Amino acid sequence: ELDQLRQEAEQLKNQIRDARKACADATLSQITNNIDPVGRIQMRTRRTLRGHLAKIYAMHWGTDSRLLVSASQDGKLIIWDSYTTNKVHAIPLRSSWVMTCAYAPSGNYVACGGLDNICSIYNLKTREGNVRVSRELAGHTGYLSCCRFLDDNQIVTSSGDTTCALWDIETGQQTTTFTGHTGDVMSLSLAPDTRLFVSGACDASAKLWDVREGMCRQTFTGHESDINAICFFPNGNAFATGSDDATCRLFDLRADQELMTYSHDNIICGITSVSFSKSGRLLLAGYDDFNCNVWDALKADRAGVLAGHDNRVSCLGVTDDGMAVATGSWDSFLKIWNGS
Amino acid sequence: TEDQRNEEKAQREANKKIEKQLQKDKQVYRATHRLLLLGASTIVKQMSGIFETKFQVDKVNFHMFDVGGQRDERRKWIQCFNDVTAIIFVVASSSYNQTNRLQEALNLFKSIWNNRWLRTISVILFLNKQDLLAEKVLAGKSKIEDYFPEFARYTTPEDATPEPGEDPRVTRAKYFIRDEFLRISTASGDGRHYCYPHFTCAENIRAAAARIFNDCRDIIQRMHLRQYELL
Amino acid sequence: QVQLQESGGGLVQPGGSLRLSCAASGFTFSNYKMNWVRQAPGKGLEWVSDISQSGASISYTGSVKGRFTISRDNAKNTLYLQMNSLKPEDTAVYYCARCPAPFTRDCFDVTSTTYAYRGQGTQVTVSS
Amino acid sequence: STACKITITVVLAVLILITVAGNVVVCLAVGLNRRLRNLTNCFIVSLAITDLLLGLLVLPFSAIYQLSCKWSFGKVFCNIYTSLDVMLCTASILNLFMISLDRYCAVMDPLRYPVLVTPVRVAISLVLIWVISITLSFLSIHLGWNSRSKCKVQVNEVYGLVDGLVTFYLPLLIMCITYYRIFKVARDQAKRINHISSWKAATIREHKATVTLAAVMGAFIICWFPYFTAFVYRGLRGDDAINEVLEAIVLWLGYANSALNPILYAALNRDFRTG
Amino acid sequence: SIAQARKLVEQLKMEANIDRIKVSKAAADLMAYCEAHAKEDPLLTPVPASENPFR
Ligand SMILES: CC(C)CCC[C@@H](C)[C@H]1CC[C@H]2[C@@H]3CC=C4C[C@@H](O)CC[C@]4(C)[C@H]3CC[C@]12C
Ligand SMILES: NCCc1c[nH]cn1
């Protein structure tokens, strides 16, 4: 009985491969060789935020492009003002190990999570003047690796037990669970219109999900090892992934295959962060050799290097108006970079 | 424009208060030692997804973190423990003729030793359950001989310190296991970390704490001596 | 797509010999350590043997030492195991396993809960 | 004989160049990087700064006086010169003592170390050192507490004995005890690494502690013992009881320690070499 | 075993029947988008010092 099902699966895989091959008329590197290269992108360090005690492990920007939030491994969640370097808030957590944080688009709530299998939601209005714990969401059976806000009353979480979940905050229940992976899930990205999202796991695969219904629609596989980061293109028709084989890749949704691979022979280290610019021309990647690289998304050639850190680079972010880039590393320092 | 001056004053006040609080927390952070307890529930009493235990010996504070709420894929969270003082490793031994457990213990230790982000962390080794070895060696069938064929050509070291009232076979088996564990760690390290082995029985209310204390003292003493070119 | 396949198996009389071959597709074969794993009826997974990128670091388990041999060919992308002088306690299902990341010295690849990079295995039986 | 003048000029020039070069290299290396800024490297920076000031603002006048053999700059400047020399030398010696005590605390009480060395205590220590130095130099020379052409420091009985037993001898004894204990512990530890594996080689076990401590406690003694012994003898017996050649030799042996301080306290540390 | 195989077969069957478009059209769409918004990328065409909030 098992053999028949295996043969059917093999036939279906052959069908998928043949259909994918049928549409590969040309390549991105042939009809994109009549465009002027951007040149050399040289950036300078404008600020430097100090005050953490251990390795910064995650970072997220705000919608006003002025306030930011940082999570440290000693049990601190700090809210910073970037123009003036002042600290606005500091919150201590119950459990020291934290692996993610978020910042609501409205500006009122913050979210935190880590190795305790619980997502904590904190309130920032605080008419009495004290930042207190507003909600605790429990129900996963593995450590929590990412969390993003949909509105002030919904949230999406990724766990290391091969599952994703959607939560309503007032009641504290799981409306829908997305299952179907084979290893730990590491990152997730939300579309601009908030009706789909992508997931990337430790089995060299990525998946696309629809929030309202609750089933998978496409599965993408071109990588050789684990995937650690993922991010959409600005128009919601493509995304880019970084992995542990020293190679980034770009996938498109209406064609259902890969378009371009970024890699070089001098690099033998993994990738921990990816992000696009505002217009979708530059691609920023963070590596384990202590510096970040700036690639040209339409030519696959290196364009610049940001080298200012003394340890492993963990988190990378780009604002909404595209006026600065923030980097955070294991040396307990945040840096803001800008051009001139 | 008095509003701008008032806003600047308020921001400076909040900044000063927050910085004072962080300066007060820094000392408490730096006057504590973190330890990771790993196996391959009874020991934790001798000293939720993750369990935290706090104790104090000779006016020194010790953390302990037990991770039993996770799965058996370890390659991703083991990386978040690269700044601990020691790793406490607990193994279970046996000598009764279904699955080779010593082999998987050895393989996991070998993987931990050579990992890139854990190349500067020492290991404290507890060879738990020595009573089962004594119980199973009297059966006349040697499981150690069944799984390890190099046990026959083994002689007890000259510096043995057996306990009074032990069959020589039990001691020879124990020292065989200890030598197996030391042979892995004396082939990779350049001088940045070591390994400290111990025996117990299947009762460490006032025993585990003292040994952990002494081992941590040794670790930090060597760390400081090596920086001045004295070791 | 990472894909691994195993071939060679069946029933042999005690004291016989047999050969197992493992074919790979989807990755650069010569950057990864590779190893052989085995599962017996009614037990858990256990590690049999392992071999490195070039062929200068070969390691076996205790019970099969002196009877089994490991080898790899990087031009044809294949891994071989040679089984000699079998005993009845060797009847099992054999799997070909790959270590998760390139250019490393460590592996974490005996996990039962559906480790990604290994195949479906072959059946070996020894009896009268 | 002009050859002697050429030789003396060459050796004095090379000595001053070495001193200034070493001190400025240490200062620039500390300043440029940020991984080497910590609470246990303030003492080395203080040592480097004091040595640089002495090498840049005191030595050339001594060289000119030695070669020309006549002081031709007045009488107030001579007093300022003497006071400055005394202050800088005393500060340097006391900084060495502080480094010794810090290493002892680090090695002997390793679990309670971060609650025993705080910036408040470092600041108190440095302030006390500089107060004692400024007192003993300036408030003593001008008020005529040491008084009984030429420009040399004057010595009587009480000042000689007090300065000798407060600046050199007690630190020497304390440092000797401290490093003896450290050396014992170092060999005790080194005996135990080589007896865990009975199938391979060992460490050096003799060129590590014995050489590194011998260098440190030999440079100090050779460079500074003769000068203070001659100081006390000159004070207790008279100025006409000493020879000029011996006095010049002991003075320059004393000055030469600032050239070796950076090499000893900044090239054997592993943090400085790595960064 | 049986349930997982059936689920995988159903998922592959569902993923088999979708519409697809040629690669060159996707490339042209990305080119057009990256050429339309070229004048609003401060990290690509830097702005002068009189409009930079960070200096
Ligand atoms: C290792 C080095 C620093 C030791 C010091 C060597 C130099 C500086 C010392 C050693 C011998 C000393 C000389 C010994 C003899 C005399 C003759 C005397 O009428 C003038 C001083 C003079 C000329 C001394 C000058 C300084 C001197 C040359
Ligand atoms: N140049 C050393 C002079 C001195 C210092 N202290 C006493 N005498």
CSV table of C-alpha atoms in Angstrom, one decimal, chain B residues 38-188:
chain,number,residue,atom,x,y,z
B,38,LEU,CA,22.0,18.9,30.3
B,39,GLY,CA,21.3,15.2,30.2
B,40,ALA,CA,21.2,12.3,27.7
B,41,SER,CA,14.8,15.5,37.7
B,42,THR,CA,16.5,14.0,40.8
B,43,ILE,CA,19.8,15.9,40.6
B,44,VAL,CA,18.1,19.3,40.4
B,45,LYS,CA,16.6,18.7,43.8
B,46,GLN,CA,20.1,17.9,45.1
B,47,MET,CA,21.5,21.3,44.2
B,48,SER,CA,7.2,24.9,31.9
B,49,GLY,CA,9.4,24.9,28.9
B,50,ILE,CA,12.5,25.9,30.8
B,51,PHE,CA,13.2,25.5,34.5
B,52,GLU,CA,15.3,27.9,36.6
B,53,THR,CA,16.9,27.1,39.9
B,54,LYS,CA,18.8,29.6,42.1
B,55,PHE,CA,21.2,28.8,45.0
B,56,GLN,CA,24.0,30.4,47.0
B,57,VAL,CA,27.2,28.9,48.3
B,58,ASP,CA,29.8,30.9,50.4
B,59,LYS,CA,27.9,34.2,49.6
B,60,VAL,CA,28.2,33.5,45.9
B,61,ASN,CA,25.1,33.2,43.7
B,62,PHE,CA,24.5,30.4,41.1
B,63,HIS,CA,21.9,30.1,38.4
B,64,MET,CA,20.9,26.8,36.8
B,65,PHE,CA,18.8,26.2,33.7
B,66,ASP,CA,17.2,22.9,32.8
B,67,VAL,CA,15.9,22.5,29.3
B,68,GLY,CA,13.4,19.6,29.1
B,69,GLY,CA,10.5,21.3,27.3
B,70,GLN,CA,12.2,21.2,23.9
B,71,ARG,CA,12.6,18.5,21.2
B,72,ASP,CA,15.6,16.4,20.3
B,73,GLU,CA,16.8,18.7,17.5
B,74,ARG,CA,19.5,20.7,19.3
B,75,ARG,CA,21.4,22.5,16.5
B,76,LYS,CA,19.6,25.9,16.9
B,77,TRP,CA,19.0,26.7,20.6
B,78,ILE,CA,22.3,25.3,21.8
B,79,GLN,CA,23.8,28.4,20.3
B,80,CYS,CA,22.2,30.7,22.8
B,81,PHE,CA,24.5,29.4,25.6
B,82,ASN,CA,27.9,30.7,24.5
B,83,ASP,CA,28.6,32.9,27.5
B,84,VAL,CA,28.1,30.4,30.4
B,85,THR,CA,30.8,29.4,32.9
B,86,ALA,CA,30.3,25.6,32.7
B,87,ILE,CA,28.2,22.9,31.1
B,88,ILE,CA,27.0,20.2,33.5
B,89,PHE,CA,26.8,16.9,31.6
B,90,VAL,CA,25.0,13.9,33.1
B,91,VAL,CA,25.5,10.4,31.7
B,92,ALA,CA,24.0,7.0,32.6
B,93,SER,CA,26.2,3.9,32.5
B,94,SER,CA,25.3,0.2,32.6
B,95,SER,CA,27.0,-3.2,32.1
B,96,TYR,CA,24.0,-5.6,31.5
B,97,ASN,CA,23.8,-7.4,28.2
B,98,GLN,CA,19.0,-3.1,24.2
B,99,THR,CA,20.5,0.1,22.8
B,100,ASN,CA,24.0,1.4,23.0
B,101,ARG,CA,23.7,4.5,25.2
B,102,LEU,CA,27.3,5.1,25.9
B,103,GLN,CA,27.9,5.6,22.2
B,104,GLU,CA,25.3,8.3,21.7
B,105,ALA,CA,26.6,10.0,24.9
B,106,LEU,CA,30.1,10.0,23.5
B,107,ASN,CA,28.9,11.3,20.1
B,108,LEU,CA,27.0,14.2,21.6
B,109,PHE,CA,30.0,15.1,23.7
B,110,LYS,CA,32.2,15.0,20.6
B,111,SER,CA,29.7,17.3,18.8
B,112,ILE,CA,29.7,19.8,21.7
B,113,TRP,CA,33.5,19.9,22.0
B,114,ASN,CA,34.1,20.8,18.3
B,115,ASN,CA,31.3,23.3,17.8
B,116,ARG,CA,32.4,26.8,16.7
B,117,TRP,CA,30.4,28.9,19.1
B,118,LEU,CA,31.3,26.6,22.1
B,119,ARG,CA,35.1,26.5,21.7
B,120,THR,CA,35.7,28.2,25.0
B,121,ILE,CA,33.4,26.4,27.4
B,122,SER,CA,34.4,23.8,29.9
B,123,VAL,CA,32.5,20.7,30.8
B,124,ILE,CA,31.8,19.0,34.2
B,125,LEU,CA,31.1,15.3,33.8
B,126,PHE,CA,28.9,13.2,36.1
B,127,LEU,CA,29.1,9.5,35.6
B,128,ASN,CA,25.8,8.7,37.3
B,129,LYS,CA,24.5,5.3,38.4
B,130,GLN,CA,27.6,3.4,39.4
B,131,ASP,CA,25.4,0.9,41.4
B,132,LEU,CA,24.0,-0.6,38.2
B,133,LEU,CA,27.5,-1.4,37.0
B,134,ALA,CA,28.2,-3.4,40.2
B,135,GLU,CA,24.8,-5.1,39.9
B,136,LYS,CA,25.4,-6.1,36.3
B,137,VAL,CA,29.1,-7.1,36.5
B,138,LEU,CA,28.2,-10.1,38.8
B,139,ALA,CA,26.0,-11.6,36.2
B,140,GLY,CA,29.0,-13.1,34.4
B,141,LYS,CA,28.1,-11.7,31.1
B,142,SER,CA,30.0,-8.5,30.1
B,143,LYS,CA,27.9,-6.0,28.1
B,144,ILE,CA,31.0,-3.8,27.9
B,145,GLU,CA,32.8,-6.7,26.1
B,146,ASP,CA,29.9,-7.2,23.8
B,147,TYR,CA,29.9,-3.6,22.7
B,148,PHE,CA,33.5,-2.6,23.2
B,149,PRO,CA,36.0,-5.4,22.1
B,150,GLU,CA,39.0,-3.4,23.3
B,151,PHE,CA,38.2,-3.9,27.0
B,152,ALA,CA,40.1,-7.2,27.3
B,153,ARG,CA,43.5,-5.6,26.7
B,154,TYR,CA,43.0,-3.1,29.5
B,155,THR,CA,45.0,-2.7,32.8
B,156,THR,CA,44.0,-0.4,35.7
B,157,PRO,CA,46.2,2.7,35.9
B,158,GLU,CA,48.9,3.0,38.6
B,159,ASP,CA,47.2,6.0,40.3
B,160,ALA,CA,43.9,4.3,41.0
B,161,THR,CA,42.2,5.2,44.3
B,162,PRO,CA,39.5,2.5,44.8
B,163,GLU,CA,36.9,2.8,47.4
B,164,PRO,CA,37.1,0.2,50.2
B,165,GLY,CA,34.9,-2.8,49.4
B,166,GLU,CA,34.7,-2.8,45.5
B,167,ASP,CA,35.3,-5.6,43.1
B,168,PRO,CA,38.3,-4.8,40.8
B,169,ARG,CA,36.0,-5.3,37.8
B,170,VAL,CA,33.8,-2.4,38.7
B,171,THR,CA,36.8,0.0,39.1
B,172,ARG,CA,38.3,-1.2,35.9
B,173,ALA,CA,35.0,-0.5,34.0
B,174,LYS,CA,34.7,2.9,35.6
B,175,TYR,CA,38.2,3.9,34.6
B,176,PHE,CA,37.7,2.5,31.1
B,177,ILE,CA,34.7,4.9,30.7
B,178,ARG,CA,36.6,7.8,32.1
B,179,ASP,CA,39.6,7.2,29.7
B,180,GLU,CA,37.2,7.0,26.8
B,181,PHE,CA,35.8,10.4,27.7
B,182,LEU,CA,39.2,12.0,28.1
B,183,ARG,CA,40.6,10.6,24.9
B,184,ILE,CA,38.1,12.7,22.9
B,185,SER,CA,38.9,16.0,24.8
B,186,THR,CA,42.7,15.6,24.7
B,187,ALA,CA,42.9,15.9,20.9
B,188,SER,CA,41.2,19.1,20.0
